[PDB]
Design a protein around this ligand. Structure first.
Ligand code: D12
Ligand code: D12
Ligand code: D12
Ligand code: D12
Ligand code: OCT
Ligand code: K
Ligand code: K
Ligand code: K
Ligand code: K
Ligand code: K
Lengths: 268, 282
């Protein structure tokens, strides 16, 4: 009977409107500054090099505009890492197929590989899940007979998951990425989130911009991803549970308010 | 009992792990066979345009050309139009684009054609994702249940007119899943691809490629329905993410049906090797 999706639908729409207004408040200023200071860089180069004329720069730009479509790529290791992006639905896009066949293979490779990877992430999920269950069984005895109650220890135990988790799956890889690709502190944490949330903008990739890295690095990246995906999958599911709790709390909250509001009001 | 099953599970994981590794190696070799030819041709014919413009204009800084290209490469990472004319442009963070950017984030599509450059925009995106991604999941779940039981209406009337004599309900489940994919790929794949073909000017394969990459939430961003500037009625850009909302629910079922098919084929090829290695030509 009750739809109940309508209330969710409008929360998501409003959530997109808020984010939209926040992003164009955060980004359009530095969009202005970049684009205005590029015409300075161009008008600098029309003057500083009279060798190039007004039309001949435009010819060069459009060859780089055509170079956008392509840019060694697709080597023995890169195409291996490309396939990892597809089945995990990360899809950084820094490497994308250009052949008509490459597209069709990728379409078929995704429709069959994405379900395949799901079973691995599920097994790695169970594997990771019961390993942490061994760590908390030791912790759920030593200070659990002592004062604090088990209905409240559920709070202490979940803190240690996120604390110890963001160390291994977020902190350590970001520190490593900071000292290998030379990223900033935020770039590395931004990359970790964008990677393990499967958003994968591709603006930061541990394999692109490829001057220095060895064969001990590019395997550990995807291996980190495999296990890290399982971590956020739990995290992004715990956060969902928090939203389910808050949703029920605020559903009955309007319940009691609109209970007493119409209660006194109806009395004549 | 308690950890006897766990030994039986890491042996399951190890077998899956290697199937995925083999599957990645196969795809790898196929892609670098499909793509690296067209990489070689593009890489060699750009050094021709390189050396063409190295001689033809000697009085340009011969080595600072690369310095200019990289400044344009860095400018490519933003929404630029660096030309002599057309020095006014449109904003990629306008009222509508940032709305569509947020749709990419919570759906974990993330086309990346528009990405935040401010350190604040990054941190908001990080917080916007970790809270928005779970949020969207409930909408897609509700739209999933909503779509699911709407199709349950249409199949209920059809699964009665198809009740002739000697019909087997275990095999009518085969007929019913065909009409799901048939009508499914029409409304959620065929019709939007045909529309994208006539609006974005794409080819037939580009549009179907885009639909898959979008609704499989891979989202390379090499094709985006709202990346160029062509006309965009703005009855169009809302229907795009609205299509995505319901289309994601469709592949979510499809990519789950395919998973079940692989679970069946896994058991069949499990016992197929049992039959083979049990006998071995008697
Ligand atoms: C241009 C037409 C492309 C058709 C691709 C069909 C691929 C079917 C794959 C089925 C995977 C289960
Ligand atoms: C060294 C500076 C790193 C600061 C990273 C800030 C990220 C804020 C995340 C907010 C968590 C809810
Ligand atoms: C019935 C739907 C109401 C759910 C309201 C959820 C509000 C989430 C607040 C998150 C802000 C950080
Ligand atoms: C981003 C915070 C959104 C807050 C929306 C609150 C909506 C209240 C839901 C009431 C449901 C009965
Ligand atoms: C690409 C499918 C590999 C099949 C391996 C089967 C091993 C039992
Ligand atoms: K790019
Ligand atoms: K994804
Ligand atoms: K992506
Ligand atoms: K993605
Ligand atoms: K991308």
């Amino acid at each position: 009977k009750w739809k109940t999706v309508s209330t969710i639908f409008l929360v998501v729409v409003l959530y997109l409107i808020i984010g939209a207004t926040v992003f164009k408040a955060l980004e359009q200023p530095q969009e202005i500054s970049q684009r205005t200071t590029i015409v300075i860089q161009r008008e600098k180069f029309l003057r500083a090099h009279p060798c190039v004329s007004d039309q001949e720069l435009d010819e060069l730009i459009q060859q780089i505009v055509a170079a956008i479509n392509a840019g060694s790529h697709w080597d023995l290791g890169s195409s291996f890492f490309f396939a990892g992006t597809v089945i995990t639905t990360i899809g950084f896009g820094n490497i994308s197929p250009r052949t008509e066949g490459g597209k069709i293979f990728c379409i078929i490779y995704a429709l069959l590989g994405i379900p395949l990877f799901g079973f691995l992430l599920a097994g790695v999920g169970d594997q990771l899940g019961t390993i942490f269950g061994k760590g908390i069984a030791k912790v759920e005895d030593t200070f659990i007979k002592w004062n604090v109650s088990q209905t409240k220890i559920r709070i202490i135990s979940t803190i240690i998951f996120i604390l110890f988790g963001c160390v291994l799956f977020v902190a350590l890889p970001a520190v490593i990425f900071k000292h290998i690709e030379g990223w900033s502190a935020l770039d590395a944490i931004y990359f970790v989130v964008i990677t393990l949330t499967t958003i994968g903008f591709g603006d930061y990739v541990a394999g692109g911009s490829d001057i220095e890295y060895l064969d001990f690095y590019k395997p550990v990246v995807w291996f980190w991803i495999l296990v890290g995906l399982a971590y956020f999958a739990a995290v992004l599911s715990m956060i969902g549970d928090w939203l389910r709790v808050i949703a029920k709390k605020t559903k009955e909250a309007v319940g009691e308010f609109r209970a007493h509001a119409a209660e006194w009001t109806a009395n004549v």
